[PDB]
Each structure stands twice: as C-alpha cells, then as structure tokens.
Amino acid sequence: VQIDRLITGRLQSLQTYVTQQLIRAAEIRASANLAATKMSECVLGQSKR
C-alpha cells in the first residue's frame, strides 16, 4: 500500500526534471544556431548588416 505513494512521487519528480531539461535544451539550440550564423556570415566575409 505504502510503496505506491513513493513510486508515484518519484516518477512525477523525474517527469518534472525531464520536462525542465527539454525546454532548456530547446533554448540552447537557438543560441547554437545564432552562433553558427555569425560564424558563417561575418568571419568568412564582410557584412553590411
């Protein structure tokens, strides 16, 4: 009877952790793409932007 409480707690904490991580990675990806854009457009040439 008791062990189901611990299981339903820990599984929810783990789901919350994964849900944080997915958002944080999806944020990092846009900075990675902006870095790669600057690399490609402003080092290898002169940009009038």
Partner 1 sequence: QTRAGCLIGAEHVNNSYECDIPIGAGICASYQTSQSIIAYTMSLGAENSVAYSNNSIAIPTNFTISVTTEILPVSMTKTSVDCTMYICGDSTECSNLLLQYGSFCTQLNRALTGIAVEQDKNTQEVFAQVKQIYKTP
Partner 2 sequence: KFNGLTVLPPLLTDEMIAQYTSALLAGTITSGWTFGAG
Partner 3 sequence: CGDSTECSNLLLQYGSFCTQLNRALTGIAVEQDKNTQEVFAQVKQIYKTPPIKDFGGFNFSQILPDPSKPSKRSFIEDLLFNKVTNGLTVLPPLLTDEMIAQYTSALLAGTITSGWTFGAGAALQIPFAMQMAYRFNGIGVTQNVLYENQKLIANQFNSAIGKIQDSLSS
C-beta of 6 vs 27, nearer to a second copy: 27
Element (DSSP H or E) covering residue 30: helix 3-38
User: Least separation, in Å, of the C-beta of 30 and partner 1?
Assistant: 10
- From residue 6 to residue 45, what is the string marking binding to partner 3 with x (rule CB under 8 A)? -x-x-x--xxx-x--xx--x--xx--xx-xx--xx--xxx
Separation CA 43–CA 12 (nearest Å): 46
With contact defined as beta carbons under 8 Å apart, do 41 and 47 qualify? yes
> Which residues contact partner 2 (rule: CB under 8 A)?
43-46
